[PDB]
mmCIF file of C-alpha atoms in Angstrom:
data_model
loop_
_atom_site.group_PDB
_atom_site.id
_atom_site.type_symbol
_atom_site.label_atom_id
_atom_site.label_comp_id
_atom_site.label_asym_id
_atom_site.label_seq_id
_atom_site.Cartn_x
_atom_site.Cartn_y
_atom_site.Cartn_z
ATOM 1 C CA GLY Q 245 0.000 0.000 0.000
ATOM 2 C CA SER Q 246 2.365 2.665 -1.219
ATOM 3 C CA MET Q 247 3.042 5.308 -3.899
ATOM 4 C CA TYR Q 248 5.671 4.945 -6.646
ATOM 5 C CA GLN Q 249 7.734 7.800 -8.137
ATOM 6 C CA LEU Q 250 7.122 8.185 -11.886
ATOM 7 C CA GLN Q 251 9.835 9.710 -14.118
ATOM 8 C CA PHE Q 252 8.397 10.809 -17.507
ATOM 9 C CA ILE Q 253 11.065 10.419 -20.243
ATOM 10 C CA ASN Q 254 10.271 12.214 -23.422
ATOM 11 C CA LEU Q 255 13.056 11.369 -25.899
ATOM 12 C CA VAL Q 256 13.600 13.896 -28.687
ATOM 13 C CA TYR Q 257 15.120 12.590 -31.901
ATOM 14 C CA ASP Q 258 14.590 13.205 -35.660
ATOM 15 C CA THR Q 259 13.041 9.994 -36.910
ATOM 16 C CA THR Q 260 14.303 11.305 -40.211
ATOM 17 C CA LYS Q 261 18.052 11.013 -39.377
ATOM 18 C CA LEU Q 262 18.124 7.286 -38.296
ATOM 19 C CA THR Q 263 18.764 3.916 -39.958
ATOM 20 C CA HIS Q 264 15.926 1.427 -39.685
ATOM 21 C CA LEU Q 265 17.935 -0.669 -37.246
ATOM 22 C CA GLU Q 266 18.393 2.451 -35.085
ATOM 23 C CA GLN Q 267 14.632 3.098 -35.211
ATOM 24 C CA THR Q 268 13.726 -0.474 -34.293
ATOM 25 C CA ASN Q 269 16.293 -0.202 -31.491
ATOM 26 C CA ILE Q 270 14.879 3.008 -29.903
ATOM 27 C CA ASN Q 271 11.308 1.764 -30.239
ATOM 28 C CA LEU Q 272 12.186 -1.134 -27.971
ATOM 29 C CA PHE Q 273 12.146 1.271 -25.007
ATOM 30 C CA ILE Q 274 8.881 3.163 -25.724
ATOM 31 C CA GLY Q 275 6.317 2.116 -23.120
ATOM 32 C CA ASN Q 276 5.659 2.164 -19.411
ATOM 33 C CA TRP Q 277 7.934 0.277 -17.048
ATOM 34 C CA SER Q 278 8.320 -0.362 -13.295
ATOM 35 C CA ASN Q 279 10.579 -1.669 -10.599
ATOM 36 C CA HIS Q 280 8.663 -2.945 -7.569
ATOM 37 C CA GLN Q 281 11.515 -2.809 -4.973
ATOM 38 C CA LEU Q 282 12.437 0.796 -5.674
ATOM 39 C CA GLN Q 283 8.842 1.730 -6.241
ATOM 40 C CA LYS Q 284 9.939 3.553 -9.367
ATOM 41 C CA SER Q 285 8.265 3.687 -12.701
ATOM 42 C CA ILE Q 286 9.261 5.239 -16.071
ATOM 43 C CA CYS Q 287 7.048 6.338 -18.968
ATOM 44 C CA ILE Q 288 9.143 6.566 -22.085
ATOM 45 C CA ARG Q 289 7.805 8.273 -25.195
ATOM 46 C CA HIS Q 290 9.019 9.877 -28.347
ATOM 47 C CA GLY Q 291 8.472 13.546 -27.489
ATOM 48 C CA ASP Q 292 9.046 16.689 -29.572
ATOM 49 C CA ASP Q 293 10.431 20.241 -29.433
ATOM 50 C CA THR Q 294 7.378 21.142 -27.334
ATOM 51 C CA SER Q 295 7.226 18.300 -24.690
ATOM 52 C CA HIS Q 296 8.298 18.740 -21.072
ATOM 53 C CA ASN Q 297 10.684 16.252 -19.317
ATOM 54 C CA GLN Q 298 12.788 16.239 -22.443
ATOM 55 C CA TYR Q 299 15.826 14.019 -22.870
ATOM 56 C CA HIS Q 300 18.515 14.202 -25.546
ATOM 57 C CA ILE Q 301 19.755 10.990 -27.198
ATOM 58 C CA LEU Q 302 23.541 10.803 -27.036
ATOM 59 C CA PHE Q 303 24.015 7.476 -28.785
ATOM 60 C CA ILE Q 304 22.036 4.560 -30.226
ATOM 61 C CA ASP Q 305 23.851 1.303 -29.712
ATOM 62 C CA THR Q 306 22.367 -1.276 -32.066
ATOM 63 C CA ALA Q 307 25.080 -3.839 -31.288
ATOM 64 C CA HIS Q 308 24.004 -4.144 -27.654
ATOM 65 C CA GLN Q 309 20.328 -3.085 -28.139
ATOM 66 C CA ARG Q 310 20.913 0.030 -26.043
ATOM 67 C CA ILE Q 311 20.523 3.797 -25.953
ATOM 68 C CA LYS Q 312 22.426 6.461 -23.959
ATOM 69 C CA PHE Q 313 20.720 9.731 -23.142
ATOM 70 C CA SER Q 314 20.691 12.742 -20.802
ATOM 71 C CA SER Q 315 18.100 15.203 -19.582
ATOM 72 C CA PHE Q 316 18.107 18.583 -21.262
ATOM 73 C CA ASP Q 317 18.703 20.157 -17.827
ATOM 74 C CA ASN Q 318 21.564 18.020 -16.494
ATOM 75 C CA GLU Q 319 24.292 16.887 -18.874
ATOM 76 C CA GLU Q 320 26.339 15.453 -15.962
ATOM 77 C CA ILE Q 321 24.024 12.403 -15.665
ATOM 78 C CA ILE Q 322 24.085 9.801 -18.388
ATOM 79 C CA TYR Q 323 21.306 7.212 -18.610
ATOM 80 C CA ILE Q 324 21.949 3.858 -20.274
ATOM 81 C CA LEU Q 325 19.004 1.705 -21.260
ATOM 82 C CA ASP Q 326 19.542 -1.908 -22.385
ATOM 83 C CA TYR Q 327 16.867 -4.095 -23.904
ATOM 84 C CA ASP Q 328 16.412 -7.552 -22.356
ATOM 85 C CA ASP Q 329 13.003 -8.876 -23.632
ATOM 86 C CA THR Q 330 9.672 -7.319 -24.558
ATOM 87 C CA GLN Q 331 8.716 -7.393 -20.863
ATOM 88 C CA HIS Q 332 12.053 -6.137 -19.416
ATOM 89 C CA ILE Q 333 14.581 -3.393 -19.918
ATOM 90 C CA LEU Q 334 17.585 -2.358 -17.758
ATOM 91 C CA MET Q 335 18.345 1.174 -16.784
ATOM 92 C CA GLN Q 336 21.735 2.326 -15.521
ATOM 93 C CA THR Q 337 23.012 5.764 -14.589
ATOM 94 C CA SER Q 338 26.540 7.187 -14.623
ATOM 95 C CA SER Q 339 28.144 10.628 -14.367
ATOM 96 C CA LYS Q 340 29.755 12.489 -17.286
ATOM 97 C CA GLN Q 341 32.985 13.468 -15.660
ATOM 98 C CA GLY Q 342 33.382 11.281 -12.574
ATOM 99 C CA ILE Q 343 33.913 7.677 -11.799
ATOM 100 C CA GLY Q 344 31.062 5.429 -10.720
ATOM 101 C CA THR Q 345 28.282 3.696 -12.586
ATOM 102 C CA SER Q 346 25.084 2.276 -11.159
ATOM 103 C CA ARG Q 347 23.998 -1.364 -11.228
ATOM 104 C CA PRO Q 348 21.717 -2.023 -14.168
ATOM 105 C CA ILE Q 349 18.217 -1.888 -12.692
ATOM 106 C CA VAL Q 350 15.507 -4.170 -14.065
ATOM 107 C CA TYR Q 351 12.219 -2.441 -15.082
ATOM 108 C CA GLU Q 352 9.312 -4.655 -16.211
ATOM 109 C CA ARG Q 353 6.524 -3.607 -18.569
ATOM 110 C CA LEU Q 354 3.229 -2.381 -17.214
ATOM 111 C CA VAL Q 355 0.240 -0.222 -18.086
ATOM 112 C CA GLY M 31 17.287 -17.325 -14.369
ATOM 113 C CA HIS M 32 20.654 -18.635 -13.142
ATOM 114 C CA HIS M 33 21.778 -21.148 -10.493
ATOM 115 C CA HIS M 34 24.968 -21.541 -8.499
ATOM 116 C CA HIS M 35 27.043 -24.599 -9.453
ATOM 117 C CA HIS M 36 30.039 -26.502 -8.092
ATOM 118 C CA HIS M 37 33.551 -25.793 -9.488
ATOM 119 C CA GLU M 38 35.237 -29.108 -8.602
ATOM 120 C CA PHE M 39 37.690 -29.091 -11.473
ATOM 121 C CA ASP M 40 39.510 -25.907 -10.538
ATOM 122 C CA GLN M 41 42.728 -26.420 -8.639
ATOM 123 C CA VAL M 42 43.253 -23.450 -6.307
ATOM 124 C CA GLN M 43 46.942 -23.891 -5.557
ATOM 125 C CA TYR M 44 47.404 -20.621 -3.723
ATOM 126 C CA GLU M 45 45.045 -17.888 -2.417
ATOM 127 C CA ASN M 46 45.906 -14.590 -0.683
ATOM 128 C CA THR M 47 43.044 -12.241 0.216
ATOM 129 C CA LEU M 48 42.929 -9.089 2.307
ATOM 130 C CA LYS M 49 42.521 -9.829 5.973
ATOM 131 C CA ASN M 50 39.043 -8.965 7.236
ATOM 132 C CA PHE M 51 37.505 -8.236 3.827
ATOM 133 C CA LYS M 52 33.764 -8.795 3.764
ATOM 134 C CA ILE M 53 31.076 -7.634 1.346
ATOM 135 C CA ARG M 54 28.578 -5.774 3.548
ATOM 136 C CA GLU M 55 26.562 -3.681 1.153
ATOM 137 C CA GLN M 56 25.577 -3.741 -2.487
ATOM 138 C CA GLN M 57 25.360 -0.907 -5.046
ATOM 139 C CA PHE M 58 22.079 -0.395 -6.768
ATOM 140 C CA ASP M 59 20.617 2.826 -8.137
ATOM 141 C CA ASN M 60 23.413 5.306 -7.391
ATOM 142 C CA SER M 61 26.846 6.261 -8.722
ATOM 143 C CA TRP M 62 28.627 5.611 -5.406
ATOM 144 C CA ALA M 63 30.930 2.818 -6.620
ATOM 145 C CA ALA M 64 34.089 4.473 -5.331
ATOM 146 C CA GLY M 65 32.399 5.006 -1.988
ATOM 147 C CA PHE M 66 31.400 1.292 -1.910
ATOM 148 C CA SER M 67 34.968 0.275 -2.854
ATOM 149 C CA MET M 68 36.707 2.577 -0.417
ATOM 150 C CA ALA M 69 34.286 1.545 2.370
ATOM 151 C CA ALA M 70 35.029 -2.125 1.902
ATOM 152 C CA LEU M 71 38.720 -1.585 1.680
ATOM 153 C CA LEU M 72 38.940 0.665 4.726
ATOM 154 C CA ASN M 73 36.618 -1.696 6.681
ATOM 155 C CA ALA M 74 39.083 -4.456 5.838
ATOM 156 C CA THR M 75 42.335 -2.658 6.596
ATOM 157 C CA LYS M 76 41.022 -0.773 9.664
ATOM 158 C CA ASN M 77 39.247 -3.993 10.822
ATOM 159 C CA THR M 78 35.896 -2.367 11.339
ATOM 160 C CA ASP M 79 32.421 -2.048 9.912
ATOM 161 C CA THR M 80 31.831 1.653 10.268
ATOM 162 C CA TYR M 81 32.545 2.724 6.737
ATOM 163 C CA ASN M 82 29.755 2.703 4.205
ATOM 164 C CA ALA M 83 29.206 4.176 0.745
ATOM 165 C CA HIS M 84 26.493 6.628 1.684
ATOM 166 C CA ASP M 85 28.478 8.220 4.521
ATOM 167 C CA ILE M 86 31.598 8.471 2.379
ATOM 168 C CA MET M 87 29.641 10.137 -0.398
ATOM 169 C CA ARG M 88 27.999 12.520 2.050
ATOM 170 C CA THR M 89 31.410 13.544 3.347
ATOM 171 C CA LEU M 90 32.516 14.212 -0.206
ATOM 172 C CA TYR M 91 29.334 16.064 -1.116
ATOM 173 C CA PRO M 92 28.270 17.815 2.182
ATOM 174 C CA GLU M 93 25.954 20.328 0.534
ATOM 175 C CA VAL M 94 24.097 18.115 -1.889
ATOM 176 C CA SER M 95 20.448 17.290 -1.098
ATOM 177 C CA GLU M 96 19.665 13.755 0.041
ATOM 178 C CA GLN M 97 17.557 13.473 -3.048
ATOM 179 C CA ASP M 98 20.426 14.424 -5.402
ATOM 180 C CA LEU M 99 23.186 12.501 -3.567
ATOM 181 C CA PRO M 100 22.623 9.133 -5.365
ATOM 182 C CA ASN M 101 23.664 10.775 -8.595
ATOM 183 C CA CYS M 102 27.040 12.045 -7.350
ATOM 184 C CA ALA M 103 30.037 10.123 -8.628
ATOM 185 C CA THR M 104 33.658 10.442 -7.492
ATOM 186 C CA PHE M 105 36.691 12.271 -8.954
ATOM 187 C CA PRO M 106 40.174 10.789 -8.747
ATOM 188 C CA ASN M 107 41.346 13.616 -6.474
ATOM 189 C CA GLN M 108 38.491 12.888 -4.051
ATOM 190 C CA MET M 109 39.556 9.260 -3.869
ATOM 191 C CA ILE M 110 42.991 10.391 -2.857
ATOM 192 C CA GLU M 111 41.915 13.135 -0.443
ATOM 193 C CA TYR M 112 39.334 10.894 1.213
ATOM 194 C CA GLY M 113 41.874 8.113 1.766
ATOM 195 C CA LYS M 114 44.346 10.577 3.200
ATOM 196 C CA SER M 115 41.638 11.913 5.535
ATOM 197 C CA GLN M 116 41.388 8.376 6.979
ATOM 198 C CA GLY M 117 45.135 8.045 7.466
ATOM 199 C CA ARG M 118 46.011 6.347 4.160
ATOM 200 C CA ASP M 119 48.713 7.686 1.849
ATOM 201 C CA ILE M 120 46.897 7.019 -1.428
ATOM 202 C CA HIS M 121 48.883 7.000 -4.728
ATOM 203 C CA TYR M 122 47.584 6.504 -8.231
ATOM 204 C CA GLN M 123 49.299 3.939 -10.489
ATOM 205 C CA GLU M 124 48.391 3.691 -14.155
ATOM 206 C CA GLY M 125 47.586 0.280 -15.592
ATOM 207 C CA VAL M 126 46.973 -3.099 -14.010
ATOM 208 C CA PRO M 127 49.140 -3.893 -10.960
ATOM 209 C CA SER M 128 51.279 -7.026 -11.320
ATOM 210 C CA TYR M 129 50.384 -10.265 -9.550
ATOM 211 C CA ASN M 130 53.536 -9.916 -7.463
ATOM 212 C CA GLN M 131 52.720 -6.358 -6.458
ATOM 213 C CA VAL M 132 49.131 -7.347 -5.470
ATOM 214 C CA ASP M 133 50.499 -10.290 -3.519
ATOM 215 C CA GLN M 134 52.888 -8.043 -1.579
ATOM 216 C CA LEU M 135 50.328 -5.252 -0.991
ATOM 217 C CA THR M 136 47.727 -7.756 0.160
ATOM 218 C CA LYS M 137 50.119 -9.426 2.643
ATOM 219 C CA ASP M 138 50.940 -5.933 3.893
ATOM 220 C CA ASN M 139 47.197 -5.230 4.383
ATOM 221 C CA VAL M 140 47.171 -2.401 1.849
ATOM 222 C CA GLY M 141 43.988 -1.909 -0.184
ATOM 223 C CA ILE M 142 43.741 -1.237 -3.912
ATOM 224 C CA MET M 143 40.810 0.330 -5.683
ATOM 225 C CA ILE M 144 40.345 -0.372 -9.428
ATOM 226 C CA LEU M 145 39.523 2.532 -11.703
ATOM 227 C CA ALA M 146 37.825 1.179 -14.869
ATOM 228 C CA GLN M 147 36.523 2.739 -18.015
ATOM 229 C CA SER M 148 34.271 1.321 -20.795
ATOM 230 C CA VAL M 149 35.371 1.485 -24.423
ATOM 231 C CA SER M 150 33.636 3.983 -26.691
ATOM 232 C CA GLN M 151 32.538 2.917 -30.152
ATOM 233 C CA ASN M 152 31.861 6.360 -31.590
ATOM 234 C CA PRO M 153 32.585 10.043 -30.768
ATOM 235 C CA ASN M 154 28.995 10.445 -29.487
ATOM 236 C CA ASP M 155 29.275 7.266 -27.299
ATOM 237 C CA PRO M 156 30.562 8.516 -23.926
ATOM 238 C CA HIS M 157 32.786 6.085 -22.123
ATOM 239 C CA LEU M 158 31.690 5.341 -18.542
ATOM 240 C CA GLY M 159 33.867 5.204 -15.460
ATOM 241 C CA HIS M 160 33.490 2.681 -12.634
ATOM 242 C CA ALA M 161 35.271 1.723 -9.414
ATOM 243 C CA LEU M 162 35.885 -1.627 -7.834
ATOM 244 C CA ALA M 163 37.878 -3.223 -5.025
ATOM 245 C CA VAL M 164 40.830 -5.524 -5.292
ATOM 246 C CA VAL M 165 40.485 -8.374 -2.752
ATOM 247 C CA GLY M 166 43.723 -10.299 -3.380
ATOM 248 C CA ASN M 167 45.233 -12.838 -5.750
ATOM 249 C CA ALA M 168 45.368 -16.561 -6.376
ATOM 250 C CA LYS M 169 47.076 -19.197 -8.485
ATOM 251 C CA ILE M 170 44.353 -21.342 -10.035
ATOM 252 C CA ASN M 171 44.988 -24.107 -12.615
ATOM 253 C CA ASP M 172 48.575 -22.903 -12.833
ATOM 254 C CA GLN M 173 47.501 -19.393 -13.831
ATOM 255 C CA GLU M 174 47.968 -16.183 -11.895
ATOM 256 C CA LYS M 175 44.716 -14.424 -11.011
ATOM 257 C CA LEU M 176 43.574 -11.334 -9.178
ATOM 258 C CA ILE M 177 40.464 -11.406 -7.023
ATOM 259 C CA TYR M 178 38.132 -8.389 -7.035
ATOM 260 C CA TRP M 179 34.701 -7.160 -5.947
ATOM 261 C CA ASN M 180 32.332 -5.204 -8.139
ATOM 262 C CA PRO M 181 29.956 -3.202 -5.899
ATOM 263 C CA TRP M 182 27.112 -4.366 -8.149
ATOM 264 C CA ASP M 183 27.568 -7.885 -6.788
ATOM 265 C CA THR M 184 27.275 -10.041 -3.671
ATOM 266 C CA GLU M 185 30.106 -12.323 -4.585
ATOM 267 C CA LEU M 186 33.739 -11.965 -5.604
ATOM 268 C CA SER M 187 35.148 -12.124 -9.171
ATOM 269 C CA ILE M 188 38.371 -13.539 -10.635
ATOM 270 C CA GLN M 189 40.524 -11.751 -13.188
ATOM 271 C CA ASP M 190 43.434 -13.070 -15.264
ATOM 272 C CA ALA M 191 46.429 -11.233 -13.974
ATOM 273 C CA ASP M 192 47.606 -10.640 -17.515
ATOM 274 C CA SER M 193 44.420 -8.879 -18.666
ATOM 275 C CA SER M 194 42.942 -5.399 -18.160
ATOM 276 C CA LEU M 195 39.551 -6.491 -19.564
ATOM 277 C CA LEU M 196 36.962 -6.756 -16.793
ATOM 278 C CA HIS M 197 33.926 -8.849 -17.707
ATOM 279 C CA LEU M 198 31.386 -7.566 -15.245
ATOM 280 C CA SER M 199 27.878 -8.751 -14.453
ATOM 281 C CA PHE M 200 25.034 -7.867 -16.884
ATOM 282 C CA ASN M 201 27.549 -8.424 -19.648
ATOM 283 C CA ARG M 202 29.233 -5.086 -19.210
ATOM 284 C CA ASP M 203 32.893 -4.751 -20.131
ATOM 285 C CA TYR M 204 35.319 -2.212 -18.711
ATOM 286 C CA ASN M 205 38.987 -1.805 -18.949
ATOM 287 C CA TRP M 206 41.122 -1.492 -15.788
ATOM 288 C CA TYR M 207 43.063 1.688 -16.604
ATOM 289 C CA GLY M 208 44.599 2.311 -13.240
ATOM 290 C CA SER M 209 44.420 1.925 -9.483
ATOM 291 C CA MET M 210 44.346 3.971 -6.298
ATOM 292 C CA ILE M 211 46.702 2.159 -3.935
ATOM 293 C CA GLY M 212 46.993 2.648 -0.194
ATOM 294 C CA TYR M 213 43.620 2.003 1.516
#
């Protein structure tokens, strides 16, 4: 009996500038996802120039089925999302300039 | 899914691990790896249980909100200054320490923290830094190994002494680019 924190992640990218593999790869992460131990949930969407909670894509990693991104308002935090299966993705955080990376955290599909 | 198995066929001919080392806490959703590593190393060499990642990080980031603290990582100079603050003359050494050096440091109850960095595949692909703890060294199947602890884990890991390539959990690879020695 307890509230979760929800982080809205609106990714901004020009669908126009991507290979099809890249597009398939990003699309893996669009959806709503939760971790029950942390009581955290993320709602990932393809946003636009006008969305709030905007995040910039730094790199699309098709080889490992992964994307790296940062929030528009804090470039010192890098998020890494890895695809596991349609019901699970892994999110990790790291810093831009320092040393220390989080454990990959499992988020399972919901909604 | 994954189970633990037996490893009957290994021949551990020699093992030398830091006196009093014990994994006491695990890193999840924060960037405190260096704090986890330093805490475990100092707990081992000081023979205590009072160090912990959160408290180290708080000391390094006294003005950051509790909410923003998880996202603070560690600079090399903080690793050095923090160790000194605890009575440890920390020195950086580039590259992977030799088996013989690890063996000597470990017998002298001196801790070593691994500084690792992922390998970028493009200019837009930022390499990531991570920190781990050396636990000691072993000769296994006639091969020299180093023993280390990734804060992500609850168990120890074994590294070929002649390799800088760390194959971490969740299939993440980092290179050991240097060490902070003296904890």
